[PDB]
Amino acid sequence: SEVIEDEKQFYSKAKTYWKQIPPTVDGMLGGYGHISSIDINSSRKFLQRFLREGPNKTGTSCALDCGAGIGRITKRLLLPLFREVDMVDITEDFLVQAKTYLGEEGKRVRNYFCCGLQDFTPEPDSYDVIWIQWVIGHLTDQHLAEFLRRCKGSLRPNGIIVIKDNMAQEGVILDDVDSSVCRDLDVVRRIICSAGLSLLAEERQENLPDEIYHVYSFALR
Numbered sequence: 524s525e526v527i528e529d530e531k532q533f534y535s536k537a538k539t540y541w542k543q544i545p546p547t548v549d550g551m552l553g554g555y556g557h558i559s560s561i562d563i564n565s566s567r568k569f570l571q572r573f574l575r576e577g578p579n580k581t582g583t584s585c586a587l588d589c590g591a592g593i594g595r596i597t598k599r600l601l602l603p604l605f606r607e608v609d610m611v612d613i614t615e616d617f618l619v620q621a622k623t624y625l626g627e628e629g630k631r632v633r634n635y636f637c638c639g640l641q642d643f644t645p646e647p648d649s650y651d652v653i654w655i656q657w658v659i660g661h662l663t664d665q666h667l668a669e670f671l672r673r674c675k676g677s678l679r680p681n682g683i684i685v686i687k688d689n690m691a692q693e694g695v696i697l698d699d700v701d702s703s704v705c706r707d708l709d710v711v712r713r714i715i716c717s718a719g720l721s722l723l724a725e726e727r728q729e730n731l732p733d734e735i736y737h738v739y740s741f742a743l744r
């Protein structure tokens with residue numbers, strides 16, 4: 524709330540920025556398209572702990588990719604582990620491109636949704652895993668909290684919400700170029716608890732370039 528002065532401009536500027544980004548992996552990853560394989564291999568081990576290690580295993584039937592872009596995570600992380608996948612993104616051109624990028628396994632993407640997370644209500648009791656990566660900084664603290672609570676009602680039994688995103692070492696940093704905020708661990712943990720979710724696991728991503736923000740993965744339900 525504190526670093527976002529005008530909510531309408533905050534969302535409007537962010538939409539303008541992504542409409543001017545090429546629909547490629549490098550566009551999704553802000554010039555770091557080459558770290559994608561490290562990210563995916565890391566995300567896979569983090570997720571497989573919940574799909575393969577009991578007692579309360581997570582299902583493998585349906586997953587929701589939030590901020591999916593052209594489907595970078597959907598192609599290499601979700602589709603090989605889940606029978607079905609839904610995608611949601613605010614940038615229409617990215618969802619158009621996804622149908623080419625996904626290739627033959629994209630036939631198992633059942634629903635494409637073009638709208639912001641602040642407007643999206645995932646269907647209740649419908650998903651095993653809701654994957655939210657590098658998009659939470661584009662939401663206000665209130666909208667993130669209400670979206671996550673709406674995600675809680677959308678989970679199947681033993682389902683989890685996974686947030687993987689940039690985390691500041693301390694405090695909150697506004698990015699006035701792409702109109703996004705970077706939060707520290709404590710601020711995000713307050714938003715998660717405000718959504719009524721419990722923390723199951725956290726993990727700091729390793730093998731990333733020195734200059735970039737720290738990346739953490741949260742498993743919630």
Ligand SMILES: N=C(N)NCCC[C@H](NC(=O)[C@H](CCCCN)NC(=O)[C@@H]1C=CCN1C(=O)Cc1cccc2ccccc12)C(N)=O
Pocket residue numbers: 551552553554555558657658660661689698701703734735736
């Ligand atoms: N040469 C130098 N020394 N430069 C000075 C140091 C620069 C360094 N830059 C970073 O750490 C950037 C932060 C981008 C700013 C808004 N995040 N982190 C990555 O690009 C990271 C790597 C792959 C995807 N990644 C995402 O962040 C996902 C992502 C990509 C594009 C736009 C996004 C908008 C919102 C959220 C995520 C976004 C810094 N400490 O600022």
Ligand SMILES: Nc1ncnc2c1ncn2[C@@H]1O[C@H](CSCC[C@H](N)C(=O)O)[C@@H](O)[C@H]1O
Pocket residue numbers: 537541551552589590591592593594595596611612613614617638639640641656657658661662
């Ligand atoms: N408010 C919002 N709601 C939903 N999606 C948003 C959004 N603001 C930006 N986005 C989308 O989120 C993506 C962030 S960068 C792409 C990250 C992607 N999850 C990946 O790991 O490959 C962009 O494609 C952008 O179109």
